[PDB]
């Protein structure tokens, strides 16, 4: 059947565009880090409160959407359609009108702001949920589904580095109106995610309608009913929250360590620009690595792998070589190898129902796939209490120690935070006595 695969080759256009698109705005934001003032409305705390409603209610309900109760047709394409266009509406708004910056926040700023928000979430759940669905062939699912990154691979490798010198010529103190121009750049290729997908992707639902109107639609609420999960989601969420913590302290604090190291450097040279172009190189090795055996073990190591550098850092404190130009460069080089940790993670939530659906045997789609990828992110908002624990008592031992070292000290705590949460990740996903043959062991079972 070409019908389901056309959902993904065009969806590959999604992947090369959507990621190319988040590549740009996000990267662009960085000189707006240079640009941030927002005289009347724009405090950090206030924007945060908008972020409060930004994520949470969006993805439970996103999943909750997809089958039309009163209309007899239901599929992802309009879901993902509701995303290609929900974002682009915004960015086109960012492009068009001339003296809108003069007006206060009350008015249009609201209207736009909603729409970009939605996309943030109506692209997380459509995309890495609609790729695994493609041609039915059982075991090779997991081996063909994180591969595609190959062309997405180029985009991030690139936004941070070479657009920047060319972007830094046109206009000064106009960044608001500046990306106004460059929007066309991004839109053209990403509008190219909305074109191809438009006349193409809506298919397997066509199939189903033709086929009896399908009580299968209700099946999607039965496989929430009969099993919300066999036991799949609730243990798997916990560890994921711990996952994202490391991303948000890498990406979030990535900028800031470059902003904030011991000494002065007029250069501002090799690191994080190269660290981006170093991180994703490991996407060629590890996604294709374990030639007979399972991605899982790859993964278990990998859950260690972002953990690991702290473990390395923790051990190398015992070494104590410089404590000055050492800490400026303290094992981020590991950063060459992180890459494909989220996708197998996002797969992990709806998989027992994924192969459980396989037992149902008829169709392909998902529910819980959203609830980890959205609760994951929030759970660092509990982390403000957690920081009182991180300093609190765990490390902390009878008072005296305060003077020796503070830069190696605060960095290690910043770096312990994901790690101390990370005890849900490996413990809960390794210790023997786990199960009989499971979605993981299906490909590993093919061995013997």
Curated annotation (Swiss-Prot):
Cytoplasmic side: 1-7, 67-76, 130-143, 201-232, 290-296, 350-366
Coiled coil: none
Membrane topology: Multi-pass membrane protein
Catalysis performed (reactions): melibiose(in) + Na(+)(in) = melibiose(out) + Na(+)(out); melibiose(in) + Li(+)(in) = melibiose(out) + Li(+)(out); melibiose(in) + H(+)(in) = melibiose(out) + H(+)(out)
InterPro entries: MFS_2, MFS_trans_sf, Na/Gal_symport, Na/Gal_symport_CS
Compartments, as annotated in UniProt: Cell inner membrane
Entry's Gene Ontology BP terms: carbohydrate transport; sodium ion transport; transmembrane transport
GO molecular function: symporter activity
Effect of mutating residue 124 to C: Alters cation selectivity. Loss of transporter activity
SUPFAM superfamilies in UniProt: MFS general substrate transporter
Record keywords: Cell inner membrane, Cell membrane, Membrane, Sugar transport, Symport, Transmembrane, Transmembrane helix, Transport
GO cellular component: plasma membrane
Transmembrane residue ranges: 8-30, 42-66, 77-97, 105-129, 144-167, 178-200, 233-255, 267-289, 297-318, 324-349, 367-394, 409-431
Residues that bind an alpha-D-galactoside: 18-19, 124, 128, 149
Protein name according to UniProt: Melibiose permease
Summary of the function given for this chain in its UniProt record: Mediates the transport of melibiose and other galactosides by a symport mechanism. Can use sodium, lithium and protons as coupling cations, with a preference for sodium and lithium. The use of Na(+) as coupling ion for sugar transport is based not on ion selectivity but on competitive binding under physiological conditions, because of a much higher Na(+) concentration under physiological conditions.
Record topological domains on the Periplasmic side: 31-41, 98-104, 168-177, 256-266, 319-323, 395-408
The family this protein is said to belong to: Belongs to the sodium:galactoside symporter (TC 2.A.2) family.
């Amino acid at each position: 059947m070409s019908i389901s695969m056309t959902t993904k080759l065009s969806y590959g256009f999604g992947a090369f565009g959507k990621d190319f698109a988040i590549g740009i705005v996000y990267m662009y934001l960085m000189y707006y880090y240079t640009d941030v003032v927002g005289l009347s409305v724009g405090l950090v705390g206030t924007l945060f409160l908008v972020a409060r409603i930004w994520d949470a209610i969006n993805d439970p309900i996103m999943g909750w959407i997809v089958n039309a109760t009163r209309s007899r047709w239901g599929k992802f394409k309009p879901w993902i359609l509701i995303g290609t266009l929900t974002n682009s509406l915004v960015l086109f708004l960012l492009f068009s009108a001339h003296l809108f910056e003069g007006t206060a926040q009350v008015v249009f700023v609201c209207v736009t702001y909603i729409l970009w928000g939605m996309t943030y979430t109506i692209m997380d759940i459509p995309f890495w949920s609609l790729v695994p669905t493609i041609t039915l062939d059982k075991r090779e699912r997991e081996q063909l589904v994180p591969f595609p990154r190959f062309f997405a691979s180029l985009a991030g490798f690139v936004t941070a580095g070479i657009t920047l010198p060319f972007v830094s010529y046109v206009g000064g103190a106009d960044r608001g109106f500046g990306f106004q121009m460059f929007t066309l750049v991004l839109i053209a290729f990403f509008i190219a995610s909305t074109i191809v997908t438009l006349r193409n992707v809506h298919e397997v639902y066509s199939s189903d309608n033709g086929v009896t109107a399908g009580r299968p639609h209700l099946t999607l609420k039965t496989i929430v009913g009969l099993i919300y999960k066999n036991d799949q989601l609730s243990c798997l969420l916990g560890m994921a929250l711990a996952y994202n913590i490391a991303s948000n302290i890498i990406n979030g604090f990535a900028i800031y360590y470059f902003t904030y190291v011991i000494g002065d450097a007029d250069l501002f040279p090799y690191y994080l620009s190269y660290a981006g172009a170093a991180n994703l190189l490991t996407l060629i090795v590890f996604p294709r690595l374990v030639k007979m055996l399972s991605r899982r073990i790859l993964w278990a190591g990998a859950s260690v792998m972002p953990v690991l550098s702290c473990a390395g850092l923790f051990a190398m404190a015992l070494a104590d070589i410089h404590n000055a130009a050492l800490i400026v460069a303290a094992g981020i080089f590991l950063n060459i190898g992180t890459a494909l940790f989220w996708v197998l993670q996002v797969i992990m939530v709806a998989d027992t129902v994924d192969y459980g659906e396989f037992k149902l045997n008829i169709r392909c789609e998902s529910i819980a796939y959203s609830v980890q990828t959205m609760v994951v992110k929030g759970g660092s908002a509990f982390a403000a209490f957690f920081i009182a624990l991180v300093l609190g008592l765990i490390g902390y031992t009878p008072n005296v120690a305060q003077s020796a070292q503070t830069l190696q000290g605060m960095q290690f705590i910043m770096i312990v935070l994901p790690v101390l949460f990370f005890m849900m990740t490996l413990v809960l996903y390794f210790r023997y006595y786990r199960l009989n043959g499971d979605m993981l062991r299906k490909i590993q079972i093919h061995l013997l």
